[PDB]
Design an enzyme around this catalytic site. Structure first.
Site, PDB file in Angstrom:
ATOM      1  N   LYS A   1      79.696 115.565  11.699  1.00 19.41           N
ATOM      2  CA  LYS A   1      80.795 116.139  10.953  1.00 19.41           C
ATOM      3  C   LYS A   1      82.066 115.425  11.393  1.00 19.41           C
ATOM      4  O   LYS A   1      82.419 115.370  12.594  1.00 19.41           O
ATOM      5  CB  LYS A   1      80.939 117.628  11.255  1.00 19.41           C
ATOM      6  CG  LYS A   1      81.990 118.332  10.421  1.00 19.41           C
ATOM      7  CD  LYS A   1      81.973 119.831  10.715  1.00 19.41           C
ATOM      8  CE  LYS A   1      82.903 120.628   9.794  1.00 19.41           C
ATOM      9  NZ  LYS A   1      82.819 122.117   9.967  1.00 19.41           N
TER      10      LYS A   1
ATOM     11  N   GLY B   1      83.492 118.879   2.482  1.00 15.63           N
ATOM     12  CA  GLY B   1      84.436 119.913   2.154  1.00 15.63           C
ATOM     13  C   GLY B   1      85.827 119.390   2.203  1.00 15.63           C
ATOM     14  O   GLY B   1      86.014 118.190   2.416  1.00 15.63           O
TER      15      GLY B   1
ATOM     16  N   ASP C   1      82.696 133.757   7.555  1.00 17.65           N
ATOM     17  CA  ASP C   1      82.499 132.934   6.358  1.00 17.65           C
ATOM     18  C   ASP C   1      81.068 132.568   6.164  1.00 17.65           C
ATOM     19  O   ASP C   1      80.750 131.406   5.948  1.00 17.65           O
ATOM     20  CB  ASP C   1      83.359 131.664   6.428  1.00 17.65           C
ATOM     21  CG  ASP C   1      83.620 131.060   5.047  1.00 17.65           C
ATOM     22  OD1 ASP C   1      83.357 131.711   4.056  1.00 17.65           O
ATOM     23  OD2 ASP C   1      84.019 129.902   4.996  1.00 17.65           O
ATOM     24  N   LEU C   2      80.183 133.549   6.248  1.00 16.81           N
ATOM     25  CA  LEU C   2      78.756 133.260   6.283  1.00 16.81           C
ATOM     26  C   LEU C   2      78.165 133.330   4.875  1.00 16.81           C
ATOM     27  O   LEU C   2      77.222 134.092   4.569  1.00 16.81           O
ATOM     28  CB  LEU C   2      78.073 134.206   7.258  1.00 16.81           C
ATOM     29  CG  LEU C   2      76.703 133.803   7.780  1.00 16.81           C
ATOM     30  CD1 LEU C   2      76.308 132.399   7.917  1.00 16.81           C
ATOM     31  CD2 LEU C   2      76.370 134.661   9.025  1.00 16.81           C
ATOM     32  N   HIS C   3      78.738 132.504   4.006  1.00 22.56           N
ATOM     33  CA  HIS C   3      78.182 132.354   2.682  1.00 22.56           C
ATOM     34  C   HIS C   3      76.859 131.612   2.794  1.00 22.56           C
ATOM     35  O   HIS C   3      76.523 131.018   3.842  1.00 22.56           O
ATOM     36  CB  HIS C   3      79.161 131.655   1.723  1.00 22.56           C
ATOM     37  CG  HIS C   3      79.590 130.309   2.143  1.00 22.56           C
ATOM     38  ND1 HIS C   3      78.788 129.196   2.046  1.00 22.56           N
ATOM     39  CD2 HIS C   3      80.760 129.879   2.676  1.00 22.56           C
ATOM     40  CE1 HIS C   3      79.423 128.150   2.538  1.00 22.56           C
ATOM     41  NE2 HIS C   3      80.629 128.543   2.917  1.00 22.56           N
TER      42      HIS C   3
ATOM     43  N   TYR D   1      81.920 127.051  11.904  1.00 23.88           N
ATOM     44  CA  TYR D   1      82.739 128.042  12.568  1.00 23.88           C
ATOM     45  C   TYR D   1      84.217 127.939  12.334  1.00 23.88           C
ATOM     46  O   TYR D   1      85.012 128.464  13.108  1.00 23.88           O
ATOM     47  CB  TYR D   1      82.352 128.119  14.067  1.00 23.88           C
ATOM     48  CG  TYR D   1      80.849 128.021  14.263  1.00 23.88           C
ATOM     49  CD1 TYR D   1      79.963 128.937  13.644  1.00 23.88           C
ATOM     50  CD2 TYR D   1      80.302 127.029  15.064  1.00 23.88           C
ATOM     51  CE1 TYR D   1      78.578 128.820  13.785  1.00 23.88           C
ATOM     52  CE2 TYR D   1      78.938 126.887  15.230  1.00 23.88           C
ATOM     53  CZ  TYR D   1      78.065 127.816  14.635  1.00 23.88           C
ATOM     54  OH  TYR D   1      76.702 127.682  14.808  1.00 23.88           O
TER      55      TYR D   1
ATOM     56  N   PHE E   1      70.382 118.738  13.758  1.00 27.18           N
ATOM     57  CA  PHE E   1      70.129 118.833  12.330  1.00 27.18           C
ATOM     58  C   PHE E   1      69.400 120.159  12.085  1.00 27.18           C
ATOM     59  O   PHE E   1      68.288 120.316  12.555  1.00 27.18           O
ATOM     60  CB  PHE E   1      69.329 117.679  11.832  1.00 27.18           C
ATOM     61  CG  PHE E   1      69.021 117.770  10.375  1.00 27.18           C
ATOM     62  CD1 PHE E   1      69.999 117.581   9.449  1.00 27.18           C
ATOM     63  CD2 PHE E   1      67.751 118.024   9.971  1.00 27.18           C
ATOM     64  CE1 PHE E   1      69.720 117.730   8.090  1.00 27.18           C
ATOM     65  CE2 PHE E   1      67.422 118.121   8.610  1.00 27.18           C
ATOM     66  CZ  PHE E   1      68.423 118.017   7.684  1.00 27.18           C
TER      67      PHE E   1
ATOM     68  N   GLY F   1      75.795 128.789   1.801  1.00 28.01           N
ATOM     69  CA  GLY F   1      75.850 127.400   2.210  1.00 28.01           C
ATOM     70  C   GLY F   1      75.904 127.191   3.725  1.00 28.01           C
ATOM     71  O   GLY F   1      75.713 126.043   4.199  1.00 28.01           O
TER      72      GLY F   1
HETATM   73  C1  LIG Z   1      79.863 121.709   7.864  1.00 29.32           C
HETATM   74  C2  LIG Z   1      78.879 122.235   6.877  1.00 29.32           C
HETATM   75  N1  LIG Z   1      78.744 121.443   5.652  1.00 29.32           N
HETATM   76  C3  LIG Z   1      79.063 122.244   4.460  1.00 29.32           C
HETATM   77  C4  LIG Z   1      80.543 122.240   4.144  1.00 29.32           C
HETATM   78  N2  LIG Z   1      80.979 123.337   3.260  1.00 29.32           N
HETATM   79  C5  LIG Z   1      82.454 123.409   3.188  1.00 29.32           C
HETATM   80  C6  LIG Z   1      82.875 124.555   2.304  1.00 29.32           C
HETATM   81  O1  LIG Z   1      82.300 124.442   0.999  1.00 29.32           O
HETATM   82  C7  LIG Z   1      80.873 124.371   1.054  1.00 29.32           C
HETATM   83  C8  LIG Z   1      80.412 123.212   1.913  1.00 29.32           C
HETATM   84  C9  LIG Z   1      77.439 120.754   5.511  1.00 29.32           C
HETATM   85  C10 LIG Z   1      76.290 121.703   5.235  1.00 29.32           C
HETATM   86  N3  LIG Z   1      74.991 121.083   5.416  1.00 29.32           N
HETATM   87  C11 LIG Z   1      74.459 120.800   6.646  1.00 29.32           C
HETATM   88  C12 LIG Z   1      73.149 120.361   6.728  1.00 29.32           C
HETATM   89  C13 LIG Z   1      72.543 120.218   7.942  1.00 29.32           C
HETATM   90  N4  LIG Z   1      73.311 120.490   9.057  1.00 29.32           N
HETATM   91  N5  LIG Z   1      72.832 120.482  10.326  1.00 29.32           N
HETATM   92  C14 LIG Z   1      73.956 120.926  11.026  1.00 29.32           C
HETATM   93  C15 LIG Z   1      75.060 121.215  10.199  1.00 29.32           C
HETATM   94  C16 LIG Z   1      74.625 120.882   8.925  1.00 29.32           C
HETATM   95  N6  LIG Z   1      75.217 121.028   7.724  1.00 29.32           N
HETATM   96  C17 LIG Z   1      76.405 121.722  10.587  1.00 29.32           C
HETATM   97  C18 LIG Z   1      76.636 122.245  11.851  1.00 29.32           C
HETATM   98  C19 LIG Z   1      77.866 122.789  12.170  1.00 29.32           C
HETATM   99  C20 LIG Z   1      78.894 122.801  11.238  1.00 29.32           C
HETATM  100  C21 LIG Z   1      78.682 122.226   9.999  1.00 29.32           C
HETATM  101  C22 LIG Z   1      77.458 121.673   9.674  1.00 29.32           C
HETATM  102  O2  LIG Z   1      79.809 122.186   9.214  1.00 29.32           O
END
Ligand SMILES: C1=C/N(CCN2CCOCC2)CCNc2ccn3ncc(c3n2)-c2cccc(c2)O/1
Ligand code: NA
EC number: 2.7.11.1
Length: 329
Positions: free
Chosen positions: A42, A24, A180-182, A219, A138, A184
């Site tokens: 992250k 992001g 922001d619980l879209h 969060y 994960f 994704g």
């Molecule tokens: C970032 C999320 N990312 C998406 C970013 N968005 C930013 C706004 O636009 C859409 C994308 C990764 C998502 N995939 C994933 C997969 C497995 N996992 N297993 C854990 C996470 C985690 N995250 C995760 C945990 C806490 C926060 C977190 C990820 O924070």
């Protein structure tokens, strides 16, 4: 009392097994493995003067809320009166100093080649650069990427029940709003457990899993409080957040601002209801299931989720939904 090198979080083998899984404006998300177990990493640049992905870096003060809220929600898995595993575990948080590891650039490049990135290649950081590195459990694959992959609306029922229960438990313990619980930010992982357990204000119950465990993540915009100290992201002066279009997601930001009169420090658990309504809307309109509803029992499930969609906005919180809505009886 001082930053650590990348190698402290990511020793050589753990670094060698990193694969990029997301991104992001904030930065980058990698998956790796240690002690036979996957984890998500992250990585967020902080405190520097460079634009990163077109935006200024956050200060340490600005990143603390996400750190704090990640810890508090993780801890809910081990509490008693208000207990849920429906958030995501937080393994560790470090402040790291250095240039970006070449092995991570290698992973970054692979993702850019195969999926494509909107981010800058993170190769321009100097050896004094600071980062926060959050290591999470994960949690699986997000709901959006599972659009075409779930079995039936029974699975969707489970997912909505898991989400509502987790939000209720966090409302009760922490006066939590995700904000922001879209789709994704809903992750799905296989479980062999037939039923999942939570406790809300001392009363324990179960949710049939349909073979999946849900984790709520990310969060960055969330809010909660403990002993009257409120932790949140003040978006009162953000313009862009409220001018999106083409998805109901973007209306939720505006509806939250309506509900709270643009006062983001306040507690308005109706925002969790709004997000759950958006997720229900996704389940009924954008998800497509491998098996459509055949049986009397399945058709009733579909009708019940439609009923939920058209009634849930008349509930005041996730807690109210969980405890009073007919969907969960
Ligand atoms: C970032 C999320 N990312 C998406 C970013 N968005 C930013 C706004 O636009 C859409 C994308 C990764 C998502 N995939 C994933 C997969 C497995 N996992 N297993 C854990 C996470 C985690 N995250 C995760 C945990 C806490 C926060 C977190 C990820 O924070
Ligand atoms: Na979880």
């Amino acid at each position: 009392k001082g930053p650590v090198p990348f190698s402290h979080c990511l020793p050589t083998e753990k670094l060698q097994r990193c694969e990029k899984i997301g991104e992001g404006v904030f930065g980058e998300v990698f998956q790796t493995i240690a002690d036979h177990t996957p984890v998500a990493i992250k990585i967020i640049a902080i405190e520097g003067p460079d634009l990163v992905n077109g935006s200024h870096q956050k200060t340490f003060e600005e990143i603390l809320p996400e750190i704090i809220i990640s810890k508090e929600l993780s801890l809910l898995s081990g509490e008693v009166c208000n207990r849920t595993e429906g958030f995501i575990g937080l393994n560790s948080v470090h402040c790291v100093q250095g240039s970006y590891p070449p092995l991570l650039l290698k992973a970054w490049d692979h993702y850019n080649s195969t999926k494509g990135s909107a981010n800058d290649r993170p190769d321009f950081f100097k050896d004094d650069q600071l980062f926060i590195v959050l290591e999470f459990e994960f949690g699986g694959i997000d709901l959006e990427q599972m659009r075409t992959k779930l079995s039936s609306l029974a699975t969707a029922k489970s997912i909505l029940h898991q989400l509502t229960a987790s939000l209720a438990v966090a409302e009760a313990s922490l006066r939590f709003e995700h904000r922001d619980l879209h789709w994704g930010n809903v992750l799905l992982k296989k479980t062999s457990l037939k039923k999942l357990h939570y406790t809300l204000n001392g009363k324990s119950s179960t949710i049939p899993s349909c073979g999946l465990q849900v984790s709520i993540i990310d969060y960055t915009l969330s809010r909660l409080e403990r002993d009257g100290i409120v932790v949140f992201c003040d978006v009162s002066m953000d313009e862009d957040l409220f001018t999106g279009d083409g998805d109901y997601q973007f209306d939720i930001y505006r509806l939250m601002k309506k509900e709270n009169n643009n006062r983001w420090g306040e507690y308005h658990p109706y925002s969790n209801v709004l997000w759950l309504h958006y997720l229900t809307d996704k389940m009924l309109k954008q998800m497509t299931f491998k098996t459509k509803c055949n049986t009397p029992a399945m058709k009733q499930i579909k009708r019940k989720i439609q009923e939920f969609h058209r009634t849930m906005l008349n509930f005041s919180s996730a807690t109210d939904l969980l405890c009073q809505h007919s969907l969960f009886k």
